[PDB]
Ligand binder design. Structure first.
Ligand SMILES: NC(=O)C1=CN([C@@H]2O[C@H](COP(=O)(O)OP(=O)(O)OC[C@H]3O[C@@H](n4cnc5c(N)ncnc54)[C@H](OP(=O)(O)O)[C@@H]3O)[C@@H](O)[C@H]2O)C=CC1
Length: 179
């Protein structure tokens, strides 16, 4: 099985892990407190510290809030060359001077940041998206990483919508707040 990583152990990380397992992946979780977090996951999931989880995969969902991104900054060297999927949402339209994905890309300039899956609710990862709204909006400045995440979305039974460069991340983040 291909291994996919998830950082964090909350509602989104748990829902994502369900969907990844159902669609044939092996999941490794990076948690601040993996002994405690291990009960939030089945035994088939490898729950460990961030620095161990990153050695087991090249594709990592960053299932934490923007305000906690800097808690990962000491991992920068270990994260070089890895794909980081920015799934985050904000409470306000155009909340910060940069989109969350551009902010993550600035923290990890030698990682490959891809925006995606922020429009999918935790409940939709468990049940599946509504048939008229299977779309997941994906973008990145790295074409190869963008295509890898597009293929992952297809394997998770979503319809990937390729919006090109990471400049698209701002309005992808505004979309849940717009109607
Ligand atoms: N909930 C949802 O339905 C959706 C959420 N999202 C996005 O997914 C991400 C997570 O959302 P959700 O799961 O709801 O958020 P949570 O509030 O559940 O936080 C998730 C994880 O963040 C980690 N965390 C908390 N504080 C820190 C810290 N100081 N340093 C490092 N890691 C920390 C914890 O993991 P640990 O304690 O294991 O380290 C926690 O389990 C957010 O960006 C959110 O916008 C996107 C779409 C839907």
């Amino acid at each position: 099985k291909v291994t996919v990583g998830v950082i964090g152990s909350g509602d989104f990380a748990k829902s994502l892990t369900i969907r990844l397992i159902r669609c044939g992946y092996h999941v490794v979780i990076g948690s601040r407190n993996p002994k405690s977090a291990s009960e939030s996951f089945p035994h088939v999931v490898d729950v460990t510290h961030h620095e161990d989880a990153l050695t087991k995969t090249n594709i990592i969902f960053v299932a934490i809030h923007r305000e906690h991104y800097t808690s990962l900054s000491d991992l920068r060297h270990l994260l070089v060359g890895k794909i980081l999927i920015d799934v985050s949402n904000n409470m306000r339209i155009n909340q910060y001077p940069e989109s969350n994905a551009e902010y993550l890309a600035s923290l990890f300039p030698d990682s490959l940041i891809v925006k995606g899956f922020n429009v999918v609710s935790a409940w939709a990862l468990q049940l599946g998206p509504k048939d008229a709204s299977r779309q997941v909006y994906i973008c990145s400045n790295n074409i190869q990483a963008r295509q890898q995440v597009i293929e992952l979305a297809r394997q998770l039974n979503f319809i990937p919508i390729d919006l090109g460069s990471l400049s698209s991340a701002r309005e992808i983040e505004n979309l849940p707040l717009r109607l």
